[PDB]
Amino acid sequence: TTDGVYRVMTRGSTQVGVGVMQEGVFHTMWHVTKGAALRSGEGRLDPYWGDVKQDLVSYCGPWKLDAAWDGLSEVQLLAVPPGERAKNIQTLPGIFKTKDGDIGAVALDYPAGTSGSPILDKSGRVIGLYGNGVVIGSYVSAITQGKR
Amino acid sequence: VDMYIERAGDITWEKDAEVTGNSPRLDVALDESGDFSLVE
Ligand SMILES: NC(=O)[C@@H](O)Cc1ccccc1
Numbered sequence: 001t002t003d004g005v006y007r008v009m010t011r012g013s014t015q016v017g018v019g020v021m022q023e024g025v026f027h028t029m030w031h032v033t034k035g036a037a038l039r040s041g042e043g044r045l046d047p048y049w050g051d052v053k054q055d056l057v058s059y060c061g062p063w064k065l066d067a068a069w070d071g072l073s074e075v076q077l078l079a080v081p082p083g084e085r086a087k088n089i090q091t092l093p094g095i096f097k098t099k100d101g102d103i104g105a106v107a108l109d110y111p112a113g114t115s116g117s118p119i120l121d122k123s124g125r126v127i128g129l130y131g132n133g134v135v136i137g138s139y140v141s142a143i144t145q146g147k148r
Numbered sequence: 149v150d151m152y153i154e155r156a157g158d159i160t161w162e163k164d165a166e167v168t169g170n171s172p173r174l175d176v177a178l179d180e181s182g183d184f185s186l187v188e
Pocket of ligand 1: 034035036037047048049050051057
């Protein structure tokens with residue numbers, strides 16, 4: 001239940017994604033868990049809210065992350081790749097231009113089990129999650145943020 | 149299928165981070181299944 005970034009594992013064992021614990025709520029991407037319940041030690045985390053179009057899911061309570069990219073500054077992907085220590089990758093986002101407005105996007109291509117890794121602003125706030133995007137050979141991830 | 153979580157760190161900015169990647173501007177559309185696609 002401790003705040004932090006967590007691996008999402010499945011059973012040998014395989015890392016299928018990553019997520020964020022904040023304010024007692026676990027945040028990850030829908031395509032990582034498909035809403036399935038999660039084990040944490042001897043406890044169980046049940047889904048609370050999910051949305052396929054946003055590709056997000058929260059466990060134990062409502063989505064808590066609400067910071068947003070400022071459109072100008074560099075950010076950091078706190079990548080947690082399978083088999084690797086959590087590590088910070090700094091980058092200037094590009095932009096997904098959509099009919100509904102602009103979304104920050106990071107042109108960083110890490111293994112699929114990194115999906116759900118948080119993207120951070122300079123203050124350490126989570127401005128979204130990594131792992132839903134498009135290909136241009138190079139993958140580009142939206143900075144996917146929910147609504148609090 | 150046992151799906152479970154393991155803590156991997158604090159959420160912090162790191163002054164010494166590696167810096168990489170470009171900043172493309174792309175026209176995209178988002179469909180009902182959450183899939184982004186390119187638009188011209
Ligand atoms: N996997 C399951 O059993 C459900 O909990 C999935 C679900 C559905 C809609 C919103 C969140 C989670």
